[PDB]
Amino acid sequence: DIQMTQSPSSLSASVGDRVTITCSASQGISNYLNWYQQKPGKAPKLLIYYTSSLHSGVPSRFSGSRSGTDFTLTISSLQPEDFATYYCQQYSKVPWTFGQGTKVEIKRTVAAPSVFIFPPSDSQLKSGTASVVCLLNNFYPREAKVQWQSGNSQESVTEQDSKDSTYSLSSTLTLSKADYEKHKVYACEVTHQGLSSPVTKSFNRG
Amino acid sequence: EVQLVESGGGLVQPGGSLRLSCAASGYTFTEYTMHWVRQAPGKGLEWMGGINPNSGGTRDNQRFKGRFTISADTSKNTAYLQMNSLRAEDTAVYYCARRGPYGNYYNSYYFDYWGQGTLVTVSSASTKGPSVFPLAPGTAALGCLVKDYFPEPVTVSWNSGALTSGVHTFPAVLQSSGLYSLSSVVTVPSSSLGTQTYICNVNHKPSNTKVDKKVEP
């Protein structure tokens, strides 16, 4: 049962840089290695087959190579839409095995997060809870903190953007019915690198 | 133009038996070999086996020989995966995958086209559809808020697909309750608020429910 060992696990390059992905078969195989690109949300997509040949209509900045049991995927010049996870499959000995993946992230220049804030909706308030949504939109890098008060909000981050390589964050502040209507002014406090001063967006419940 | 469209993936009780289905079109089904590749969440891909629609003969994987069963229906251009005695670790996204190129070229053997995947999720909890509330609006930024549903995934689109640019569908979170929750926002011209209708379609296939909420200000 042939075992593909891919390195590195994840790398951050800059756009137009050259990225090198390794993959080392546990035992010897021929040219029988395929290279797949999986993007967040999508199913894996073939790029390079027979260890070096380009699938029809794949940007030729993509190369694959071979020295031994060791295999080498070559994005000559990284592009912001190449943000992906890349897999080698071996098709030498059944059962077919894939790599473990390499996550290829894009390093770009700092952006600051456009902030927006959302009161709870009339419609939702009848359920007995209220959810306040702070939204940080299209910032880089990924580090940034959101402040409302704590114990309440969960939060989550869009994956890397395939066009401007930016993130986005949905911090949601879910307190209770009339625990919402007790107090009056709601605001999320955002703090992020490309923002010189910790920015705060707010609304008064009324 | 080749499209593989999957379906079937929802919640399965631990022990129960689901059946997924690839639905191929845009070529001749009996010329190519469908397969099934599986991917647990955050994880690597795993080969499940394949089947030849033209002979019906199945290429198997001896760790799935027992529970799983691949098959196909020439008439409906459809290849299936049957899954019995399901356990927590069988949760994954299940892809089908065609294997080109035409023939057996002894140098070329790869999964060229794939289905979009479907999320089988095996756990004791019960299904609940989501409730969608709006996040109402230079640049205006509206969204809609999907809340209290089980299991993953919900599939959000905007203006039924016409609106793709500027969208941001955040990944779900699990709540101490045990129901999921996510948000999805777009940004749009303010000047367009008065004259374009913005609607979000939260399709929840593990319960056969799609909720379209209209976001006004």
Side-chain angles (χ1 to χ4, degrees), chain B residues 159-207:
Chain B
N159 280 353
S160 305
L163 186 46
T164 72
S165 37
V167 191
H168 277 332
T169 292
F170 289 79
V173 196
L174 201 81
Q175 300 176 125
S176 37
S177 148
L179 303 165
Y180 276 88
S181 171
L182 75 79
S183 312
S184 154
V185 301
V186 64
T187 60
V188 302
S190 310
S191 84
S192 82
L193 286 201
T195 59
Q196 299 173 340
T197 302
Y198 297 126
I199 295 157
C200 82
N201 325 92
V202 195
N203 187 4
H204 188 236
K205 296 168 139 171
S207 65

Side-chain angles (χ1 to χ4, degrees), chain A residues 32 34 36 38 43-44 46 50 87 91 96 98 116 118 121 123-124 135 137-138 154 156-157 161 168-170, chain B residues 39 43 45 47 95 108-111 114-115 133-136 141 145 168 170-171 173-175 183 185:
Chain A
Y32 308 120
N34 287 338
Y36 294 96
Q38 181 171 38
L46 180 95
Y50 205 49
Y87 293 96
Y91 69 112
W96 313 139
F98 300 95
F116 302 80
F118 295 94
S121 64
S123 148
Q124 172 196 174
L135 168 75
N137 208 89
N138 291 123
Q154 328 198 265
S156 64
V157 182
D161 198 88
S168 303
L169 184 159
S170 177
Chain B
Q39 189 187 15
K43 285 253 61 194
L45 301 131
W47 187 61
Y95 299 104
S108 325
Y109 171 101
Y110 46 93
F111 310 123
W114 303 58
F133 320 94
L135 300 170
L145 165 77
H168 277 332
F170 289 79
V173 196
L174 201 81
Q175 300 176 125
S183 312
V185 301

